[PDB]
Design a protein around this nucleic acid. Sequence first.
RNA 1: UCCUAAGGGAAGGGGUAACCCCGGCAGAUAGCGCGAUCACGCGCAUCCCCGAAAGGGAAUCGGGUUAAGAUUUCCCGAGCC
RNA 2: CGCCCCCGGCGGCCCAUGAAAAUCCGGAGGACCGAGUACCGUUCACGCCCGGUCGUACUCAUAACCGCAUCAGGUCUCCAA
RNA 3: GCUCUGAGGACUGACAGUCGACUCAGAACUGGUACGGACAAGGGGAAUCCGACUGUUUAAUUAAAACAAAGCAUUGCGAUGGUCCUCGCGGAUGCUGACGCAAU
RNA 4: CCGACUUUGUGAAAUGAAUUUUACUUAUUCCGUGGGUCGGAAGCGGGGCAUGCCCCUCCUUUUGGCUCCAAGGCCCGGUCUUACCGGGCCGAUCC
Lengths: 98, 49, 91, 136, 251
Amino acid sequence: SGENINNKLQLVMKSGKYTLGYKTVLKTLRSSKGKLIILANNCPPLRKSEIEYYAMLAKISVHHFHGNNVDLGTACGKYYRVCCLSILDPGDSDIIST
Amino acid sequence: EYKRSRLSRNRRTVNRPYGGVLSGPAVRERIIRAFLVEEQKIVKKVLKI
Amino acid sequence: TKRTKKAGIVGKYGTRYGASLRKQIKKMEVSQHSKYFCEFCGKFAVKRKAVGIWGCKDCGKVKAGGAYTMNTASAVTVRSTIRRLREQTEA
Amino acid sequence: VKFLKPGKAVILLQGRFAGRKAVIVRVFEEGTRDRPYGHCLVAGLAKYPKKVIRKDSAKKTAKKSRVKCFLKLVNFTHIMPTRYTLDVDFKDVASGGPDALATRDKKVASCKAAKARLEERFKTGKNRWFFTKLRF
Amino acid sequence: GRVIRAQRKGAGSVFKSHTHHRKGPARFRSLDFGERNGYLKGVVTDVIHDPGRGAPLAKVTFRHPFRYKHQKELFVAAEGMYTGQFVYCGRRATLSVGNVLPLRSVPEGGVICNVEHHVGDRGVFARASGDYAIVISHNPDNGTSRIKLPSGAKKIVPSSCRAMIGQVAGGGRTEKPMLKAGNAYHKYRVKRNSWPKVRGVAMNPVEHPHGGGNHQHIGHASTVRRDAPPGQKVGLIAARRTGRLRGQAAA
RNA sequence: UCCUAAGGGAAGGGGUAACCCCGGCAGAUAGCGCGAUCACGCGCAUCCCCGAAAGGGAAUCGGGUUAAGAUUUCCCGAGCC
RNA sequence: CGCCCCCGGCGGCCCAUGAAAAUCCGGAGGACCGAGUACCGUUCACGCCCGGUCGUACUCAUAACCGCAUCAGGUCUCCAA
RNA sequence: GCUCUGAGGACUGACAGUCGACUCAGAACUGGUACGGACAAGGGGAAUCCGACUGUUUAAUUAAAACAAAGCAUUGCGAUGGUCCUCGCGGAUGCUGACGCAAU
RNA sequence: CCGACUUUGUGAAAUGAAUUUUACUUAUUCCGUGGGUCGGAAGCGGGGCAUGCCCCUCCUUUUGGCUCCAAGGCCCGGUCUUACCGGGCCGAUCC
Ligand SMILES: [Mg+2]
Ligand SMILES: [Mg+2]
Ligand SMILES: [Mg+2]
Ligand SMILES: [Mg+2]
Ligand SMILES: [Mg+2]
Ligand SMILES: [Mg+2]
Ligand SMILES: [Mg+2]
Ligand SMILES: [Mg+2]
Ligand SMILES: [Mg+2]
Ligand SMILES: [Mg+2]
Ligand SMILES: [Mg+2]
Ligand SMILES: [Mg+2]
Ligand SMILES: [Mg+2]
Ligand SMILES: [Mg+2]
Ligand SMILES: [Mg+2]
Ligand SMILES: [Mg+2]
Ligand SMILES: [Mg+2]
Ligand SMILES: [Mg+2]
Ligand SMILES: [Mg+2]
Ligand SMILES: [Mg+2]
Ligand SMILES: [Zn+2]
């Protein structure tokens, strides 16, 4: 259900709190303020594995996007390249609801 | 004219691990990669049950 | 202002070499100079560095590929054949 | 859950001690007066213990088993933290207080005591990962 | 008469290969215990242009199996390898592009390059830019295999011979017209002194069998025997036919 | 002067009627090296020499001075390897 | 928008990717080692001594080079109001 | 030639002050209609033959339509091989291998 | 270019009264290494549907990191004689 995650994330973009980018998704993890991490498929393996590590430490879920970094940016409805995402407040959506 | 008896050591070195040979952004990634893969060695051994 | 009706990239060759040679070198003129998408960093910043070598400006990957295009259509067939042929024998 | 709490092992990631292991002593989570970035005080090992084996005599084992400790305020971005822990919270009062580190004599005294207790824990044989150096 | 241009090439005086900026031989690893009974991980460090050759060359840094040092090997680039890739060398290395395997590990139909001929001769077939060999069948009662080579020739090779999975990079290089004596000259400068080539019909009889005559013409059959002495074996050596190829003649 | 480039000569060997011709052909290889001598241990891997007054390159600047030397060769001062 | 020299960082062309080594530096590792009426180091500063062999004048050309010459010929460069 | 006009800037505190080396246009007057006044510096056009072009060549009588060229085609060759050198051992192509070498 | 003799040995079959086919490895030729793991047999796991007795594996797939000069155990010997150096095997299956 790649389209079913794309639409939910589109709704999180309009409703909830969210954060983009490696240097700030990490800050959310250290604050433990995030609730779910989304990772583009071609996120550089060092970066991806260290974010996986912090997620394991913070007991937070990690989802691996089905596209690429350009596709994750487009799904978030942003005009640039994105490879990291954190859902701070899910908002009026059903992403954490998996 | 890098010879030891022609430059001061502080002017010839950089005080970090791998300094003077590897930049900071490279050494940082080697630290992260070495740690993470060392962790995967033992998670893989624990998977070996 | 439009500067060539049809010549384009092979306009530098001037009035020489023949219509057919210009019109069949034109495609591998444009293809080796265009910027190709990098599957590692998603930018349109892969550009040829030598015959068969394609370097990316940002992420530092250099990729071995076709001489005048990044990815040969024959090579896509090869990679797909390998993919399938690994799957069935890993089964 | 928050994983940057005093007592956790942390590998310093950058600057004159990158690659050294350490333990977080106390965390300045909500910035400070003059360091608005998040940071945290950490105590680590500048010089790891050398390998001890049965063959060498007691004097050389004692020679090889000593440690050199260092205190550093690190930005969280500069520490890449880990699950492991050091159970010695008995530096809470030793290296605690926002006063035991301003002056050099005070700092070096704290490092001497931290040496003594980390050498004791190395003697105990526990936390072997904390004393095997990151081999990068 | 005098010695012909084609005979003069056997001395090397001005006909040796221009090998000053070449980066060394492009070949596999020494076949050994690890590469025979397991796999070895090598990291590709850089894909360099080798002067005088159409294909890129991939420098690969293995770790020496039994002594403490690296090994910078230098492979022929198979289309797709990028710096940082881990290429696996040995028998039980999985079948992916850039890996090198024996033919006992490559299924029928697999496309390979840099094939060995005698097990351990370090890779000789299918090396030019954009050439590959298709592994056709395996005979396990002989421990042998068959391959279709770029020429279309079909060869039986030992089954323990290594082969790089994939095809040589730089494919389609020869598709581009050079359009210039300039490009031709710069092509052959870094290969060898075999350009320009003077039509023997525009020579004098003393140096070429075709030369001479008030008009420019060969004079006799342009096809010579296989056994013609050197200095006369010039033209179409032992031709089986001539003329523009049509139909099955071009198969 | 030192180091290599294209290249050249060569020890063992192969050829040669002999002068002479081949250098990777692999030979207990030319050379062994380093820590130690209050001695010994460890290593030996593509293993010699020659080849550039335009390539690479330990270090110098100023002012004077002779009939003719020196800008930096002598003198004066100040440096550098 | 001045001339010459050098440097910086962009961009461009290549079926052309545009030398090697001596030398120098840095690092990975840590076998082995030491005092506090004192002994082990120190790539620090200062201090002392020595620096060998060969070329070195002059033309570099419508007169010092080659063309049987004090030959309208030929011979590589740097500075350039 | 000479006398002007206009436009294009910098720094400092939609303006004010200080500075500015140049370029570009326009005008009035003037001369024995002379003005790129010396120097420097394409004759143009209509066609035919040949070679596509650039390039190279008989030093000391021939610079071309000749040679080369890319383009086109053909032939041999899968290494125990093709073309070739070598008195012999051995060697060049080959630090190569058919998108290649070799002969036309 | 091909034929014969020579280096050129071994045993085996089928055709005639020598001929083609084969098999062996040490002569011979070639190839590869810094002659760095070859041959047979063990063992560690996986397939069992005659518990067979025949097969398949060798503790590295992983992200451009690092790996050397052994840790560990056992058995001797020298020694202060109440305090310490040299040995041997296993680790690293045998033949
Ligand atoms: Mg410094
Ligand atoms: Mg020529
Ligand atoms: Mg041609
Ligand atoms: Mg021709
Ligand atoms: Mg003629
Ligand atoms: Mg003739
Ligand atoms: Mg003729
Ligand atoms: Mg010399
Ligand atoms: Mg010199
Ligand atoms: Mg010089
Ligand atoms: Mg003096
Ligand atoms: Mg550039
Ligand atoms: Mg002089
Ligand atoms: Mg002089
Ligand atoms: Mg003279
Ligand atoms: Mg004379
Ligand atoms: Mg012409
Ligand atoms: Mg003439
Ligand atoms: Mg003439
Ligand atoms: Mg040959
Ligand atoms: Zn990229």
